[PDB]
Amino acid sequence: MKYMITSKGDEKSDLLRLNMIAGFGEYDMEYDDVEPEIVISIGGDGTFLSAFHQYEERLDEIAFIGIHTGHLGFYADWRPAEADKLVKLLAKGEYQKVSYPLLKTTVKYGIKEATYLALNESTVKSSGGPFVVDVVINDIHFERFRGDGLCMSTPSGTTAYNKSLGGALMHPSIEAMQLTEMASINNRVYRTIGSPLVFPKHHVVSLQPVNDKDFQISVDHLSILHRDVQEIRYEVSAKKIHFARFRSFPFWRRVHDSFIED
Amino acid sequence: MKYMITSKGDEKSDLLRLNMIAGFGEYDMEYDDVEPEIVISIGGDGTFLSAFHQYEERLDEIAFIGIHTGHLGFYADWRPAEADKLVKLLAKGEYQKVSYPLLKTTVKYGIKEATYLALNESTVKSSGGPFVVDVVINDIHFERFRGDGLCMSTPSGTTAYNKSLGGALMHPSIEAMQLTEMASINNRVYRTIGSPLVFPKHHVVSLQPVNDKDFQISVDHLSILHRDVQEIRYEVSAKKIHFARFRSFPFWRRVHDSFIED
Amino acid sequence: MKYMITSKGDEKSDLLRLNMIAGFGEYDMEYDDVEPEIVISIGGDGTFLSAFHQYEERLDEIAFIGIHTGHLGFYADWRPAEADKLVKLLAKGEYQKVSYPLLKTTVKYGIKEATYLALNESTVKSSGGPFVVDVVINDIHFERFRGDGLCMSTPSGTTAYNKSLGGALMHPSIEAMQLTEMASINNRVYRTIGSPLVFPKHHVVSLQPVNDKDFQISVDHLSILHRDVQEIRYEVSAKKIHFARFRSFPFWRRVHDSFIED
Amino acid sequence: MKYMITSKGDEKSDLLRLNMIAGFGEYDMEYDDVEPEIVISIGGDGTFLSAFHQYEERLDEIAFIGIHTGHLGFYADWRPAEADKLVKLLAKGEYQKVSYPLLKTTVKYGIKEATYLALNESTVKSSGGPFVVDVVINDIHFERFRGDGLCMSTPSGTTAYNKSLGGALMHPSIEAMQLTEMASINNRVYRTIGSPLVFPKHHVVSLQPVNDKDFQISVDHLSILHRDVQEIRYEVSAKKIHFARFRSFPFWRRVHDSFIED
Numbered sequence A, B, C, D: 001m002k003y004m005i006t007s008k009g010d011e012k013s014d015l016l017r018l019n020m021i022a023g024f025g026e027y028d029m030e031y032d033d034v035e036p037e038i039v040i041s042i043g044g045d046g047t048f049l050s051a052f053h054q055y056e057e058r059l060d061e062i063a064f065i066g067i068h069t070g071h072l073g074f075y076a077d078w079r080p081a082e083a084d085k086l087v088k089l090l091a092k093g094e095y096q097k098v099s100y101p102l103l104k105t106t107v108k109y110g111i112k113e114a115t116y117l118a119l120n121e122s123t124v125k126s127s128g129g130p131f132v133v134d135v136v137i138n139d140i141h142f143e144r145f146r147g148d149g150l151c152m153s154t155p156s157g158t159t160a161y162n163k164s165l166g167g168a169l170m171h172p173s174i175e176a177m178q179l180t181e182m183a184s185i186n187n188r189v190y191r192t193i194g195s196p197l198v199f200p201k202h203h204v205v206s207l208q209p210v211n212d213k214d215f216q217i218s219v220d221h222l223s224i225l226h227r228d229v230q231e232i233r234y235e236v237s238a239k240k241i242h243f244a245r246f247r248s249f250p251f252w253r254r255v256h257d258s259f260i261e262d
């Protein structure tokens, strides 16, 4: 059906994209980057994240596929050498779709609301000075966090920033989000839980400013300064990203290949 | 209905048990420690774990209640001062039952099989020398683990040994188990994932010996030497423990009270 | 002799300073904030750090004393209630001086050199995008670090940011510096040592840019954006801070009081 | 002069030892395993540790050399291919000796005293049940430790068990020892420092039993059950191990080669 291809934009990725478009020309496949049904990303995980955010309003109508042209990217299922095989299999169709959970971030202001969707994670840091927030879980005051910041990760994000922060890797069939600390202060007077926390669907984690109300909020690649923040709210999204799957590539093998050996 | 009470066996817990039995005598409540319907544990979390293992063949017919007579125990919902209030509320009934997931460990031998059920965790260490096992996830060889041992935790166990090992705390509505490492060796030749791993229901984690086949396996309080082990298999149990709940005491508040302040 | 007093500037600290000046007026003590011989800091550790940096060119002529007017500050030896006792003991003199090591940071540029002295630590982060540096130890290429940043700590700084990053606490009689990682990336292609590293006097740790040459460098409280950086070099300073000591307050007791109980 | 060679005892190591003995026969070199002046260890780090403990009463008269016949061992300076070159260089002499610090463990009993010397580390675990000790630093009660155990590491041991426990790697010119925790319990009632602690020469760390007095104490490879323990005392030894050095192989390069790439 309708499909489009994003490229990382180096020569290897552009030419692979051109060759796949030529190969798709030999089938009932219309290039359409307004309303695609398949979105192919050629590059790295950064490329795949940008493709996801380019179509985040049509997530339920799109299956994604990643081709990694560098060292294996985690959202990539294919090497460039298999692209012809991919064209042919997509062209037929009848592949299997798998869905991963996503993270909703809501940012509320003084005098207003912005929501963002994350495939990897949403993080919060201060805009300059100390970072201090009260952490409220389903309206229960849980802790006052002092430190560098906090990271809230989807399951497929757990292998990314979350992992570097000591968080657990969780299989993406678990509808959850995971909160990790960045350099928390713990002494006689200041206390945090320390451990990563794993939240199910429908739990709401709210960060509330204590002093400064300005924060740097990142969602996947994109980092914005928000001013006069009243609340940051995290919950598992009702929306999901869908991947087209043509063969078995289990998550735990994907983890093995990315971190142990390949 | 039918009920029994276990005690930690110090004077404070024994007398509380005697007083609750006297108070239950004023209602349609029959003391029965063969086929109870309510099991009250008076003591600490060790006491509550022993009560769970004393009735692990009737889990589906029993609701558990814990009273902590020391500093707050994590499976405890009541202080000794509220025991009269508890007697009265239980006696009426119409409480709410909540269920937590449990962990199944299967140990296979040479020339045989033993299964165990865990409320907190199951751990494996060597019987003396180096601990080396291959870690196999749904029949995929994932890593060769060298170190002190491994811990597989239920959700309610994540606040226990798991937490001390760096694992994530997970809300018990998530049907999962979590594997943490004990002092893994990582150098040029030996490699583990490092991170805790969180597994959904129906995933099977198998540990397979490499050299030595003798291991010390702990399940909650109980540690046994197993000889000539061919495999240790972990999966989320189909069985669940049921608690009688009389009031709201959310898991995250329970975590707050146990680790942040109370 | 000559002395001065800095204040955190709240009402409690200002009035304590005024009262100590009045008490010093009854002795051979001249207030002199150009060339003091004793520098008293009234406030918190931030106050004490600012006092240190105000006199960092006369470190060898100055003994420092800290009074904490909030919850115990780590460079503080006195509570406000003991200030009269302090005035009297200082006025006599014949106290003991103890010295802690300091950290030298050298920043070299394109087309130039800046050096800074740290009592707690010097950290480096990127100016926006990814942080990637080559870590060179005594001219040996040791690792390529990818992550949020790096922290180099003095011994007395090991209880501050360093501690939050997982670093070891080291007794300040050890002339050393300690490098800790902030959220390093470790996968199949990217590898860091992970562990904190402890360097003796005369070892030189050099960070060399890989791509971006702009970095945010913090030295104790003070954070500056440096552009067109060619190298950042760390070594234990030859300079030391001197404290006036009037009674035994061992470092490990100070650690106990600050983190375990007091 | 006088020399001996230990072997790991596989065919490759035995034949290398025989060939080196034959090569030493062509020089003024007498094989003497009672009073050697050079001790060559052919094998792995376990082999080198056993050689050290075989001669621990003549440390001041001996220079050690390690040849690794497997993947690089950390106390090894030579590959088997360079053994002829080693024979020749040793035979002349005029090499440089370098010294690393060692750790003294003293175990005191009821009704008695045993001391041990460690090149890597000394650890303490319980003999079965919970491990609880009071940690006393220079006669100051510092913390009550509850957990799996404690590890006290020399500088050259910091890359071994210590590293797996989160400890810092410290250059062996620093005369220190480092204490790391194994799975400490930290909750509302139980508190440890968490961080590794680095102690200078002449500081004494004493572990004192709280309840159980039976402990499993390991010193390098060797693990013994001690009963009726009154105290375990750690301090940097006055004794040092001496290595014969024929070429530059800096510690930080040795770390790089063992953990980053080689």
Ligand SMILES: NCCN(CC#Cc1nc2c(N)ncnc2n1[C@@H]1O[C@H](CNC(=O)CC(=O)O)[C@@H](O)[C@H]1O)C[C@H]1O[C@@H](n2cnc3c(N)ncnc32)[C@H](O)[C@@H]1O
Residues within 6 Å of the ligand: A044, A045, A046, A049, A072, A073, A074, A075, A120, A121, A156, A157, A158, A159, A160, A161, A162, A164, A220, A221, C129, C130, C131, C146, C147, C148, C182, C183, C184, C185
């Ligand atoms: N232009 C890169 C922008 N990043 C794109 C991405 C990604 C990504 N996602 C995953 C994933 N789910 N599971 C495993 N592998 C992953 N990859 C891999 O991470 C690397 C890329 N990233 C960096 O070098 C750091 C950087 O560009 O500051 C490549 O190796 C990918 O292959 C954005 C993402 O970078 C993550 N990130 C930021 N700071 C991090 C830190 N200190 N530690 C670890 N990850 C960090 C964060 O998750 C964000 O979403």
Ligand SMILES: NCCN(CC#Cc1nc2c(N)ncnc2n1[C@@H]1O[C@H](CNC(=O)CC(=O)O)[C@@H](O)[C@H]1O)C[C@H]1O[C@@H](n2cnc3c(N)ncnc32)[C@H](O)[C@@H]1O
Residues within 6 Å of the ligand: B044, B045, B046, B049, B072, B073, B074, B075, B120, B121, B156, B157, B158, B159, B160, B161, B162, B164, B220, B221, D129, D130, D131, D146, D147, D148, D182, D183, D184, D185
């Ligand atoms: N006679 C005690 C035998 N233990 C009973 C228990 C328990 C328990 N369960 C939980 C829980 N789910 N969430 C939080 N609090 C918990 N508690 C608390 O842990 C403490 C008890 N335990 C010890 O002191 C250590 C010991 O007796 O070796 C009390 O403070 C309870 O309150 C058995 C359980 O002890 C755990 N354990 C063993 N080694 C551990 C370590 N190094 N770090 C942390 N926990 C460890 C393991 O989970 C096992 O199931």
Ligand SMILES: NCCN(CC#Cc1nc2c(N)ncnc2n1[C@@H]1O[C@H](CNC(=O)CC(=O)O)[C@@H](O)[C@H]1O)C[C@H]1O[C@@H](n2cnc3c(N)ncnc32)[C@H](O)[C@@H]1O
Residues within 6 Å of the ligand: A129, A130, A131, A146, A147, A148, A182, A183, A184, A185, C044, C045, C046, C049, C072, C073, C074, C075, C120, C121, C156, C157, C158, C159, C160, C161, C162, C164, C220, C221
């Ligand atoms: N206006 C404060 C600016 N900071 C002054 C200081 C200090 C300080 N030094 C020590 C010390 N050597 N050993 C133990 N206690 C220490 N204190 C204590 O740390 C707290 C103050 N600091 C913050 O809240 C964080 C902040 O103002 O971003 C008080 O509790 C002091 O008492 C500057 C210092 O703040 C440190 N810092 C920065 N980010 C940190 C993090 N994520 N985790 C831990 N420390 C962090 C860094 O060491 C810097 O030098």
Ligand SMILES: NCCN(CC#Cc1nc2c(N)ncnc2n1[C@@H]1O[C@H](CNC(=O)CC(=O)O)[C@@H](O)[C@H]1O)C[C@H]1O[C@@H](n2cnc3c(N)ncnc32)[C@H](O)[C@@H]1O
Residues within 6 Å of the ligand: B129, B130, B131, B146, B147, B148, B182, B183, B184, B185, D044, D045, D046, D049, D072, D073, D074, D075, D120, D121, D156, D157, D158, D159, D160, D161, D162, D164, D220, D221
């Ligand atoms: N038959 C082996 C008995 N071990 C000999 C040794 C050693 C050794 N010393 C160092 C060192 N200073 N810096 C770096 N590399 C080192 N190696 C390397 O460690 C590996 C050997 N050891 C094991 O597999 C674990 C085991 O035999 O339980 C080889 O890769 C050597 O090359 C005794 C030593 O094993 C250490 N050890 C024990 N439990 C550990 C754990 N969970 N994590 C890390 N190290 C552990 C402890 O230091 C002890 O002294």
